[PDB]
């Protein structure tokens, strides 16, 4: 699903992230330089709006690489 990438990637990307420019396939958040904590949970807002499907408690906070994130969420309206 291209749809959640673009709109999610786009989202944190231009959220004062990082740059998709630096993200590599198995780059790490917070970790290899994650976002906020209030921007997570705000972000988690918005891809939630357009996923039908919240992705805050531990189910976020179980989450650290960003490609796992919009892996599971991707598949999610993908098919669920």
């Given at each position: 699903?291209?749809?959640?990438?673009?709109?999610?990637?786009?989202?944190?990307?231009?959220?004062?992230?990082?740059?998709?420019?630096?993200?590599?396939?198995?780059?790490?958040?917070?970790?290899?330089?994650?976002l906020?904590?209030?921007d997570v949970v705000?972000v988690?807002?918005?891809?939630?709006?357009?996923?039908?499907?919240?992705?805050?408690?531990?189910?976020?906070?179980?989450?650290?690489?960003?490609?796992?994130?919009?892996?599971?969420?991707?598949?999610?309206?993908?098919?669920?």
């Amino acid at each position: 699903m291209n749809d959640v990438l673009t709109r999610v990637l786009e989202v944190v990307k231009n959220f004062e992230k990082v740059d998709a420019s630096k993200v590599t396939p198995e780059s790490h958040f917070v970790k290899d330089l994650g976002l906020n904590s209030l921007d997570v949970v705000e972000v988690v807002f918005a891809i939630e709006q357009e996923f039908i499907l919240d992705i805050p408690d531990h189910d976020a906070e179980k989450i650290q690489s960003i490609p796992d994130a919009v892996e599971y969420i991707a598949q999610n309206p993908m098919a669920k």
